[PDB]
Design a protein around this ligand. Structure first.
Ligand SMILES: OC[C@H]1O[C@H](O[C@H]2[C@H](O)[C@@H](O)[C@@H](O[C@H]3[C@H](O)[C@@H](O)[C@@H](O)O[C@@H]3CO)O[C@@H]2CO)[C@H](O)[C@@H](O)[C@@H]1O
Ligand SMILES: [Ca+2]
Ligand SMILES: [Ca+2]
Length: 683
């Protein structure tokens, strides 16, 4: 099998995701439509059900709309059962669960979308057409509730395959967080507090932890090829890391979370998450910058490049970052005026690092500022749009040009309006020229490239006013004019490659598991995969793909390297996280840990999951507000189940490290349910 295989659910670098808002796409079956207040046949009441269903998607697949576009994957709304109540709205006079973000039963389907049967047809049909199916998943909450008024909505009631677990009011079981609502003041504030009025789930609760894990297996069993975790910014890192392990242990599938970042916003917690959570993230830094440059004009091409560079240093796995120019939460990219800007944003995105995602209707020039104006019904299905063709032409490149899929990014020419970058993966190359100026042409001189000597034509076929170029023996390019709004794409696909690792998934494993190595020039005869210096067991060997079983090495981060049967050594793919064992979520609590100003408390310990006594990699700074109040600190950490750990807390400020006194604390991590440890600061 090849990395481009639809069966390659662990890699998305060569794919193109098409984000669909189920209800607003296509009503393939009217018989399943809602009745009364819920439904709106007219499609004018933006907060009501329109009738979009899985059958409608199936139709768009079978009819060639999506396929003809070059889309290799689809990301649909949460398939789980939603509340049935019609919330009050002043503007739209009615607010429903049309979006599927108000869960009611994570073990059942949304009757309006279809049945498990209709879901299967979707999965199957999609697969038969070589399209991967991604689903939205929001384990952070249920629905909008009011502790005071159990008469509001459905009180955020949670069901387990029909049987009620509990509501928001009278939550004797402690399934929810009754800490009020978040104001985004702090990281901890937005975790243990309500996201708006949504009933916050207490994943620390054994029942909830188990429920959520089993709930996901239901869908994994349905044949899904990916998951989009909702509000990963509103749940504890520890629990999420532990949740990921359960998924990857059951059946690995590409997973990416939603960590909202504003304009010019950079969050260290966000970076750490993407680097340790065991899941990928939506590239908000990318998305927000692209809009600044191509849409709102609040930054230059210089800002775009710096984003490309800073991004590449922060993220350990940039090839996994899910890019995009807009979404159901943002104002539609197209905001009137010229359509050139969108196309340039699409082309840039399609040829840039990571995994591109396209919001439904982008190719239709759909407009709409703010929710729910940005969630209008599918306008038209015209395949003539310049935007529709852009995707059609560029999408496939991700499969044909490994440089576009896993290659690096390097600037070759840049001014305030012009950006000429180059994607390189060995000998394979891709050169893209963009001129944001819709009225100014530029004379390009002094340009150099890795493109072999010769004459290159535009892959876009002049679609965006692009043309051909000539590269000299010294990689120099003949001076040319970059007309206004021009977009050109030149490439060179090598005929022969050396061992080159482009991708590795998953990035979070355990000894005995199987990882998939994607790249080029591995050979047809089995070679050797090494986790540092320790060789693994080959499960399958191909020129572009290698499946290997993780060796029983010391749990920790490892660097992957390949070795063809001919002795040729590949490049290394670093920071593969090898855990100690099955993860479990344990809450650490330490009392009487008073500190000075600017001093925080951290957790260090016996295992890799605990940093292995490395104070620089200590867990924290620990929390001290919501659940527990200072001087008592706490934190949700993922640890190896059934393991006896030795730990100790420390205080860190910036230039000082105060360890806890006495002997190390000892604890045996549970095997099933979640756990909690409470200790007192040793002097
Ligand atoms: O040869 C010395 C010089 O070479 C390298 O410079 C290259 C730039 O890195 C590259 O950006 C490009 O420069 C263009 C600028 O992007 C643009 O602002 C405008 O000024 O046109 C320039 C083209 O001349 O090309 C040059 C090479 O031609 C290298 O990076 C430098 O450190 C070094 O000084
Ligand atoms: Ca319908
Ligand atoms: Ca939460």
């Amino acid at each position: 099998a090849s990395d481009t295989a639809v069966s390659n659910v662990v890699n998305y670098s060569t794919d193109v995701i098409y984000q669909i808002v189920t209800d607003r796409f296509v009503d393939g079956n009217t018989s399943n439509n809602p009745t009364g207040d819920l439904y709106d046949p007219t499609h004018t009441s933006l907060k009501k059900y329109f009738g979009g269903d899985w059958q409608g998607i199936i139709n768009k697949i079978n009819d060639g709309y999506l396929t003809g576009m070059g889309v290799t994957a689809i990301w649909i709304s949460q398939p789980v059962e939603n509340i049935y109540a019609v919330l009050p709205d002043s503007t739209f006079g009615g607010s429903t669960s049309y979006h599927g973000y108000w869960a009611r039963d994570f073990k059942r389907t949304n009757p309006y979308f279809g049945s498990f049967t209709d879901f299967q047809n979707l999965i199957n049909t999609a697969h038969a057409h070589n399209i991967k199916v991604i689903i939205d998943f929001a384990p952070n909450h249920t629905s909008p509730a009011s502790e005071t008024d159990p008469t509001y909505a459905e009180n955020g009631r949670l069901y387990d395959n029909g049987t009620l677990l509990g509501g928001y009011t009278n939550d004797t079981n402690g399934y929810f967080h009754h800490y009020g609502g978040t104001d985004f003041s702090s990281y901890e504030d937005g975790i243990y507090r309500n996201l708006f009025d949504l009933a916050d789930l207490n994943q620390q609760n054994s029942t909830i932890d188990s429920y959520l894990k089993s709930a996901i297996k239901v869908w994994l069993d349905m044949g899904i090829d990916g998951i989009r975790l909702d509000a990963v910014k509103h749940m504890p890192f520890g629990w999420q890391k532990n949740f990921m392990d359960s998924i990857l242990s059951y059946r690995p599938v590409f997973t990416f979370g939603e960590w909202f970042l504003g304009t010019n916003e950079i969050d260290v917690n966000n970076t750490y998450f993407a680097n340790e959570s065991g899941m990928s993230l939506l590239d908000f830094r990318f998305s927000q910058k692209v809009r600044q440059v191509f849409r709102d004009n609040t930054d230059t091409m210089y800002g775009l490049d710096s984003m490309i560079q800073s991004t590449a240093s922060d993220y350990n796995f940039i090839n996994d970052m899910v890019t995009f120019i807009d979404n159901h939460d943002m104002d539609r990219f197209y905001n009137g005026g010229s359509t050139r800007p969108v196309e340039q944003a699409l082309a840039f995105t399609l040829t840039s690092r990571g995994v591109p995602a396209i919001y439904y209707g982008t190719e239709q020039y759909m407009t709409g500022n703010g929710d729910p104006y940005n969630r209008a019904m599918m306008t038209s299905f015209n395949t003539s749009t310049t935007a529709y063709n852009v995707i059609k032409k560029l999408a496939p490149l991700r499969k044909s040009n490994p440089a576009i899929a896993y290659g690096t990014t390097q600037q070759r020419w840049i001014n305030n309006d012009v950006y000429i970058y180059e994607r390189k993966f060995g000998n394979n190359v891709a050169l893209v020229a963009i001129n944001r100026n819709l009225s100014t042409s530029y004379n390009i001189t002094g340009l150099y490239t890795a493109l072999p000597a010769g004459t290159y034509t535009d892959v876009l076929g002049g679609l965006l006013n692009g043309n051909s170029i000539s590269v000299a023996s010294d990689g120099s390019v003949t001076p040319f004019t970059l007309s206004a709004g021009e977009v050109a794409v030149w490439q060179y696909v090598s005929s022969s490659n050396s061992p080159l690792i482009g991708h590795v998934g998953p990035t979070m494993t355990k000894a005995g598991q199987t990882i998939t190595i994607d790249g080029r020039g591995f050979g047809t005869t089995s070679g050797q995969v090494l986790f540092g210096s320790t060789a693994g067991t080959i499960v399958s060997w191909d020129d572009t793909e290698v499946k290997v079983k993780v060796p029983s090495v010391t749990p920790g981060k490892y660097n992957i390297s390949l070795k063809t049967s001919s002795g040729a050594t590949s490049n290394t793919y670093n920071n593969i996280n090898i855990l100690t064992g099955n993860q479990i979520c344990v809450r650490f609590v330490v009392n009487n840990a008073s500190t000075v100003y600017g001093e925080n408390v951290y957790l260090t310990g016996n295992v890799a999951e605990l940093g292995n006594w490395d104070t620089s990699k200590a867990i924290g700074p620990m929390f001290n507000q919501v659940v527990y109040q200072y001087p008592t600190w706490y934190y949700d950490v993922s640890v190896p189940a059934g393991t006896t750990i030795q730990f100790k807390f420390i205080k860190k400020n910036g230039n000082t490290i105060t360890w806890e006194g006495g002997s190390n604390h000892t604890y045996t991590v549970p095997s099933s349910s979640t756990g909690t440890v409470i200790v007192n600061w040793q002097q």
